């Protein structure tokens, strides 16, 4: 039988007023015989009508993927409204309902600290600039690195780790040529999270 999967907006999209957050109700295993799918959407149990169906996609395994997309408002999401996708179809004894929302819980502000490389790292060809982000709730976030207005893409970031006080930490490590560090170049940690002022903070880092 046909199966339903419901997916949240990207954090960045819920957090940048200039972006468009959307929730997405994907239905897989849609038979060639009974391809017709009906979406009803509810927001905190109240029905809404502005969803839109994406173009039908035929798969390798002889079945259709049908996808409906609900635009949502930045603040409904961040205020925690619950979004319900209800899917009907002939091959289905009963409509499948699925619900999602932001994780429940009082938001807490990340503490964002930048950290120079270890003295002992200074022999090597490349050094690690560390961005520690500690004590945020919920785990929804974006961390990025830059220098002089341009993105620096040679970083990696840990997933959120749950802590004993109930908030999360992670760290992001950007890797530069030692000579770039030695050259006075200023680097910056971009953190986007709901409980920050204007959803954004930035911390800088240079040779002292």
């Amino acid at each position: 039988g046909p199966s339903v999967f419901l997916f949240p907006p990207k954090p960045k999209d819920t957090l940048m007023i200039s972006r468009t957050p959307e929730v997405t109700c994907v239905v897989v295993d849609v038979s060639h015989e009974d391809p017709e799918v009906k979406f009803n959407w509810y927001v905190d149990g109240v029905e809404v009508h502005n969803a839109k169906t994406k173009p039908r996609e035929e798969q390798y395994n002889s079945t259709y993927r049908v996808v409906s997309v609900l635009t949502v408002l930045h603040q409904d999401w961040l205020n925690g409204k619950e979004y319900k996708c209800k899917v009907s179809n002939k091959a289905l004894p009963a409509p499948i309902e699925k619900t999602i929302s932001k994780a429940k819980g009082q938001p807490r502000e990340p503490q964002v600290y930048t950290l120079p490389p270890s003295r002992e790292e200074m022999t090597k060809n490349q050094v690690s600039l560390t961005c520690l982000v500690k004590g945020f709730y919920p785990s929804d976030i974006a961390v990025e690195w830059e220098s002089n207005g341009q993105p620096e893409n040679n970083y990696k970031t840990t997933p959120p780790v749950l802590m004993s006080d109930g908030s999360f930490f992670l760290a992001s490590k950007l890797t530069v040529d030692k000579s770039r560090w030695q050259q006075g170049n200023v680097f910056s940690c971009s953190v986007m999270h709901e409980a920050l002022h204007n959803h954004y903070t930035q911390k800088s880092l240079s040779l002292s």
């Binding site: 940048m16 200039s18 830059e146 207005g149 002022h197 204007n198 959803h199």
Partner: peptide, 13 residues
């Protein structure tokens, strides 16, 4: 005030 990310507006209070 307002915050911007790579010249793209984030949010304003």
């Amino acid at each position: 005030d307002c915050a911007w990310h790579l010249g793209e507006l984030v949010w304003c209070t």
